[PDB]
């Protein structure tokens, strides 16, 4: 079979590439020390120590003027961990910190002092730290990753609802019916099945959803134990979720579900945990759940949970760099919480290969959990040995967690490449013949300007015979992605999909076009020419630029917004402008303010075509109060940020809007130049940019 090796390939794939902290902040900490600062370039900030005492005595032969005793040692970090834990809160003198802290070349001394300090004061070391934008850089780094894997985990994530489903069935764990209404919940074709985003007070889920029809309701929870949870109704549902989060750990378990900012209770209303602990307690109508029931509009519910997603790991990374005083152990690991739950629960079977629950990584009825990987005495070796970890929880996932996750998926992954293949597409100039001889078709079966399904003798997997228009004819076998448009080829003998090569579909005068190369200009379904958008065009990356700057080459971002904000774009209305405006609602309540959002390709069609913030055709209301949450009320939220709007616009759409002050709210005192909008309200569609930079 196999099929499974290539699905744990791109699970691992996935895990090892994936940005830690710590090895972010240690290679800038190095290019700075190779540019900005070469005199410092002999120092690894992995392996010098920050080290804060209480007691000081004076030296005439050290680099600070004192020398320390270990007994008195308050605090043992890395530079890098330093850097992290943002340790120039520690003190509000920086020239002061010299007499109670220094660099030091080991953990472990009876003395601190000449003989093991660095020639760099601390001094120096936070008027670095203060120059550096560490939350700015991870971001960098994760938009760099999704770049590469965004279709990756999407496909993954497809692939794992459709592998847990057989497996249940086969088990006998869930009826026919309900692995029909899974299966066709995916696209909805029919429209036969109503699909939500799950929320709470109207805080959304990142990786859960729910789709229900008059016949039978479903929740997908991904890396619980029974990753679909059915039920006849909604109201059964909400008491089957009641009595699982009755458990004070799995109530937590669940709530990990959710971005950190909408964990956290806000100023006027309360956040996700008080609200599940006051449901469970009875205060909460228990209706509350599902309360806000926003509409799906993408196709593929994939496409939402994913973009979902990764929205949050942006969030809970500006959290984890800004924010991480007195905070959780498993804080850090939030980010990687959605692609971790993942893990097959199909068995696999390889030689000394790390399955998760090897890991300190187990299953639970509401997701997955680490406290073997955190607190279990397995690893407390290696826990024990890491230092800083003492005094700073966060430091649990980031110098501990993470790296020992990567490490054991690179393992993995290199075992796996040596066992297994990743290419065995057709190429018609041989094996065609075989193949069609296999699957008794020919080419008159397959039609032009259409497609044909088949069934693979090895695991029965769906798969796509076309002809391609612009590569002479030539047949290839392709599945559909989670994007409407693309389809990847796929391995003959197994059906995984094959990521680098690629296929989009086109409709015009009732004929359909395939093609390799990209994209035609011009498709019927999503086709913005015809809406009324002043500014629509497709965004050119820098390799199309004729800059040929450093680093020439990148086709994933474009200057669009950055440094200089474009001239054919609107400005965004300055954050400041807008707090003000909404704080004195009175004089502005009509006032008019701009916005920028990145968002899919569905997402801005519905915004350009029904010209309402989020893509919905319902009328608004009257009395236009927009004070706050309304039952059955749904938000989008935008933002005035240039950072998060090119970072949430690359690879995807930007969508840009003039909207009245009287619906914007903002409850949450962290994030930033971001703003909550009701969809069923009224916008003006200033502009529309594709950043797919598809050629």
Same mark, same amino acid.
């Given at each position: 079979?196999?099929?499974?090796?290539?699905?744990?390939?791109?699970?691992?794939?996935?895990?090892?590439?994936?940005?830690?902290?710590?090895?972010?902040? !240690?290679?800038?900490?190095?290019?700075?020390?190779?540019?900005?600062?070469?005199?410092?370039?002999?120092?690894?900030?992995?392996? /010098?120590? %920050?080290?804060?005492?209480?007691?000081?005595?004076?030296?005439?032969?050290?680099?600070?003027?004192?020398?320390?005793?270990?007994?008195?040692?308050?605090?043992?970090?890395?530079?890098?961990?330093?850097?992290?834990?943002?340790?120039?809160?520690?003190?509000?003198?920086?020239?002061?910190?010299?007499?109670?802290?220094?660099?030091?070349?080991?953990?472990?001394?009876?003395?601190?002092?000449?003989?093991? $300090?660095?020639?760099?004061?601390?001094?120096?070391?936070?008027?670095?730290?203060?120059?550096?934008?560490?939350?700015?850089?991870?971001?960098?780094?994760?938009?760099?990753?999704?770049?590469?894997?965004?279709?990756?985990?999407?496909?993954?994530?497809?692939?794992?609802?459709? +592998?847990?489903?057989?497996?249940?069935?086969?088990?006998?764990?869930?009826?026919?019916?309900?692995?029909?209404?899974?299966?066709?919940?995916? %696209?909805?074709?029919?429209?036969?099945?109503?699909?939500?985003?799950?929320?709470?007070?109207?805080?959304?889920?990142?990786?859960?959803?729910?789709?229900?029809?008059?016949?039978?309701?479903?929740?997908?929870?991904?890396?619980?134990?029974?990753?679909?949870?059915?039920?006849?109704?909604?109201?059964?549902?909400?008491?089957?979720?009641?009595?699982?989060?009755?458990?004070?750990?799995?109530?937590?378990?669940?709530?990990?579900?959710?971005? /950190?900012?909408?964990?956290?209770?806000? #100023?006027?209303? /309360?956040?996700? =945990?008080?609200?599940?602990?006051?449901?469970?307690?009875?205060?909460?109508?228990? #209706?509350?759940?599902?309360?806000?029931?926003?509409?799906?509009?993408?196709?593929?519910?994939?496409? +939402?949970?994913?973009?979902?997603?990764?929205?949050?790991?942006?969030?809970?990374?500006?959290?984890?760099?800004?924010?991480?005083?007195?905070?959780?152990?498993?804080?850090?690991?939030?980010?990687?919480?959605?692609?971790?739950? /993942? +893990?097959?629960?199909?068995?696999?079977?390889?030689?000394?290969?790390?399955?998760?629950?090897?890991?300190?990584?187990?299953?639970?009825?509401?997701?997955?959990?680490?406290?073997?990987?955190?607190?279990?005495?397995?690893?407390?070796?290696?826990?024990?040995?890491?230092?800083?970890?003492?005094?700073?929880?966060?430091?649990?996932?980031?110098?501990?967690? *993470?790296?020992?996750?990567? !490490?054991?998926?690179?393992?993995?992954?290199?075992?796996?490449?040596?066992?297994?293949?990743?290419?065995?597409?057709?190429?018609?100039?041989?094996?065609?013949?075989?193949?069609?001889?296999?699957?008794?078709?020919?080419?008159?079966?397959?039609?032009?300007?259409?497609?044909?399904?088949?069934?693979?003798?090895?695991? #029965?997997?769906?798969?796509?015979?076309?002809?391609?228009?612009?590569?002479?004819?030539?047949?290839?076998?392709?599945?559909?992605?989670?994007?409407?448009?693309?389809?990847? $080829?796929?391995?003959?003998?197994?059906?995984?999909?094959?990521?680098?090569?690629?296929?989009?579909?086109?409709?015009?005068?009732?004929?359909?076009?395939?093609?390799?190369?990209?994209?035609?200009?011009?498709?019927?379904?999503?086709?913005?020419?015809?809406?009324?958008?002043?500014?629509?065009? *497709?965004?050119?990356?820098?390799?199309?630029?004729?800059?040929?700057?450093?680093?020439?080459?990148?086709?994933?971002?474009?200057?669009?917004?950055?440094? $200089?904000?474009?001239?054919?774009?609107?400005?965004?209305?300055?954050?400041?402008?807008?707090?003000?405006?909404?704080?004195?609602?009175? !004089?502005?309540?009509?006032?008019?303010?701009?916005?920028?959002?990145?968002?899919?390709?569905?997402?801005?069609?519905?915004?350009?075509?029904?010209?309402?913030?989020?893509?919905?055709?319902?009328?608004?209301?009257?009395?236009?109060?927009?004070?706050?949450?309304?039952?059955?009320?749904?938000?989008?939220?935008?933002?005035? +940020?240039? #950072?998060?709007?090119?970072?949430?616009?690359?690879?995807?759409?930007?969508?840009?809007?003039?909207?009245?002050?009287?619906?914007?709210?903002?409850? =949450?005192?962290?994030?930033?130049?971001?703003?909550?909008?009701?969809?069923?309200?009224?916008?003006?569609?200033?502009?529309?940019?594709?950043?797919?930079?598809?050629?």
């Amino acid at each position: 079979n196999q099929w499974q090796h290539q699905y744990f390939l791109s699970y691992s794939e996935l895990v090892a590439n994936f940005p830690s902290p710590e090895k972010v902040v !240690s290679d800038y900490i190095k290019h700075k020390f190779s540019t900005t600062l070469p005199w410092f370039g002999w120092a690894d900030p992995d392996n /010098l120590y %920050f080290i804060r005492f209480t007691q000081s005595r004076s030296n005439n032969k050290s680099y600070t003027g004192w020398d320390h005793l270990g007994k008195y040692a308050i605090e043992t970090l890395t530079l890098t961990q330093a850097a992290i834990v943002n340790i120039g809160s520690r003190f509000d003198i920086f020239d002061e910190a010299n007499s109670t802290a220094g660099i030091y070349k080991t953990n472990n001394a009876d003395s601190f002092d000449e003989t093991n $300090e660095a020639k760099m004061l601390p001094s120096e070391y936070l008027y670095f730290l203060r120059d550096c934008d560490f939350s700015n850089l991870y971001n960098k780094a994760l938009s760099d990753y999704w770049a590469e894997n965004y279709e990756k985990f999407s496909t993954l994530l497809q692939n794992y609802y459709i +592998s847990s489903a057989y497996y249940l069935y086969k088990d006998s764990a869930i009826s026919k019916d309900e692995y029909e209404f899974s299966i066709d919940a995916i %696209f909805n074709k029919k429209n036969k099945i109503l699909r939500y985003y799950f929320d709470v007070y109207g805080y959304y889920s990142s990786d859960m959803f729910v789709a229900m029809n008059d016949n039978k309701t479903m929740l997908f929870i991904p890396g619980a134990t029974n990753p679909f949870i059915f039920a006849d109704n909604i109201t059964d549902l909400r008491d089957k979720i009641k009595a699982l989060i009755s458990d004070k750990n799995t109530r937590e378990l669940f709530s990990k579900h959710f971005s /950190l900012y909408d964990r956290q209770d806000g #100023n006027t209303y /309360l956040g996700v =945990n008080s609200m599940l602990e006051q449901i469970v307690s009875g205060v909460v109508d228990t #209706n509350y759940i599902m309360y806000s029931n926003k509409n799906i509009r993408e196709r593929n519910v994939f496409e +939402s949970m994913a973009f979902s997603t990764r929205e949050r790991s942006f969030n809970d990374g500006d959290v984890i760099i800004k924010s991480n005083a007195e905070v959780q152990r498993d804080y850090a690991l939030n980010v990687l919480q959605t692609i971790l739950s /993942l +893990s097959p629960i199909f068995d696999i079977v390889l030689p000394e290969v790390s399955i998760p629950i090897s890991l300190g990584i187990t299953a639970s009825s509401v997701g997955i959990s680490f406290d073997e990987l955190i607190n279990g005495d397995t690893y407390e070796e290696r826990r024990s040995a890491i230092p800083g970890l003492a005094t700073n929880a966060v430091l649990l996932g980031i110098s501990f967690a *993470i790296p020992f996750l990567i !490490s054991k998926a690179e393992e993995n992954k290199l075992i796996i490449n040596n066992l297994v293949g990743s290419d065995e597409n057709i190429l018609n100039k041989n094996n065609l013949g075989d193949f069609l001889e296999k699957y008794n078709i020919s080419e008159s079966d397959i039609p032009e300007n259409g497609s044909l399904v088949i069934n693979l003798k090895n695991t #029965n997997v769906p798969v796509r015979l076309v002809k391609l228009n612009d590569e002479e004819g030539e047949i290839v076998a392709i599945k559909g992605s989670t994007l409407s448009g693309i389809y990847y $080829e796929v391995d003959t003998e197994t059906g995984y999909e094959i990521l680098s090569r690629r296929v989009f579909r086109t409709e015009y005068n009732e004929k359909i076009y395939w093609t390799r190369g990209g994209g035609l200009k011009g498709g019927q379904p999503f086709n913005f020419e015809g809406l009324d958008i002043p500014v629509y065009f *497709i965004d050119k990356p820098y390799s199309e630029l004729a800059s040929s700057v450093e680093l020439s080459f990148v086709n994933d971002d474009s200057p669009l917004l950055f440094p $200089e904000m474009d001239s054919r774009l609107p400005k965004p209305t300055p954050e400041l402008d807008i707090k003000y405006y909404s704080s004195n609602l009175s !004089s502005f309540k009509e006032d008019t303010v701009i916005l920028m959002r990145g968002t899919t390709e569905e997402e801005a069609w519905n915004i350009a075509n029904y010209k309402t913030a989020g893509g919905s055709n319902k009328d608004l209301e009257e009395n236009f109060i927009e004070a706050g949450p309304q039952f059955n009320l749904s938000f989008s939220e935008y933002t005035s +940020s240039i #950072n998060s709007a090119d970072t949430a616009s690359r690879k995807h759409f930007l969508v840009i809007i003039k909207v009245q002050v009287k619906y914007i709210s903002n409850d =949450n005192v962290l994030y930033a130049n971001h703003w909550a909008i009701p969809d069923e309200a009224p916008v003006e569609v200033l502009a529309v940019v594709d950043r797919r930079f598809i050629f």
